[PDB]
């Protein structure tokens, strides 16, 4: 039993909800919140911009130190950093950004990072400003992630479409 509330169950391990991931994280304080990161951990917009703003820019300060030490992530890769006031940990996961021409096949590799954590609050990878089809992202999620994932979908119109079209 966990503290997530109001999710629709899609499969044995995948759950979905119309919610603002920032507000959901503040309420649940999950062990792991997933950020829709880019390889530079520059949290300018989308989910990343919103998660960072909620931390009063502490996420960005920590991220800049991480990059200065370790260099950029790989597309499809991830790193674990602090969750600040939102969660115990933040798993920064880089899905391909279609508006940069990156291979959509890397979306599966990106979701594989979730399997290193028993329970996660997450957005759909590569959705929103990363330019991928959220219906496809949900399909890859369900077919790749085996751990317990709670998906927060910001747009109410999009959520109903994902549910209604889910096979």
Ligand X SMILES: NC(=O)c1c[nH]c2ncnc(NCc3cc(O)ccc3F)c12
Footprint of ligand X on this chain (CB under 6 A)?
A: 20-22, 46-47, 50, 123, 127-128, 134, 152-155, 158
> Around 131, how many Cα atoms within 13 Å sit in the side-chain half-sphere?
9
Q: Residues 56, 87, 52, CA angle at the centre, nearest 5°?
A: 30
Q: Pick the closer one to ligand X by CB: 75 or 125.
A: 125
Cβ of residue 102: shortest distance to ligand X, in angstroms? Answer: 16
Choose among 101, 116, 93: nearest CA to 39.
93
For 11, the token pair is: 């499969």
| CB 47 to ligand X: min, Å | 4
Q: How far is the CB of 73 from ligand X (least distance, A)?
A: 19
Check if the beta carbon of residue 105 is closer than 8 Å to that of residue 71: no
Nearer to ligand X among residue 73 and residue 121 (C-beta): 121
In the complex with ligand X, which residue's Cβ is closer, 65 or 155?
A: 155
Closest CB to ligand X among 141 and 153? 153
Task: Closer to ligand X by CB, 1 or 166: give it.
Answer: 166
Residue with tokens 């899609």: 10
Nearest partner of 23 among 68, 75, 87, judged by Cα: 87
Looking at beta carbons, which residue is closest to ligand X?
154
Beta strands in 5-127 (DSSP E): 8-9, 14-18, 32-36, 78-82, 89-93, 119-122
- Closest contact distance (angstroms) between CB of 154 and ligand X is 3
* CB of residue 79 to ligand X, shortest distance in Å: 20
């Amino acid at each position: 039993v966990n503290s997530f509330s109001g999710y629709l169950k899609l499969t044995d391990n995948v759950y979905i909800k119309n919610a603002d991931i920032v507000e959901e994280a503040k309420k649940v304080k999950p062990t792991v919140v997933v950020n829709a990161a880019n390889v530079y951990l520059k949290h300018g917009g989308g989910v990343a911009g919103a998660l960072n703003k909620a931390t009063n820019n502490a996420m960005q300060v920590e991220s800049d130190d991480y990059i200065a030490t370790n260099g950029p992530l790989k597309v499809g890769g991830s790193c674990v950093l602090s969750g600040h006031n939102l969660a115990k940990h933040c798993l920064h996961v880089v899905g391909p950004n279609v508006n940069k021409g990156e291979d959509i096949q890397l979306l599966k590799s990106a979701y594989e990072n979730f399997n290193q954590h028993e329970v996660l609050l997450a957005p759909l990878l590569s959705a929103g400003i990363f330019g991928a089809d959220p219906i496809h992202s949900l399909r890859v999620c369900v077919d790749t992630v085996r751990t317990n994932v709670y998906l927060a979908v910001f747009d109410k119109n999009l959520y109903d479409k994902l549910v209604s079209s889910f096979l």
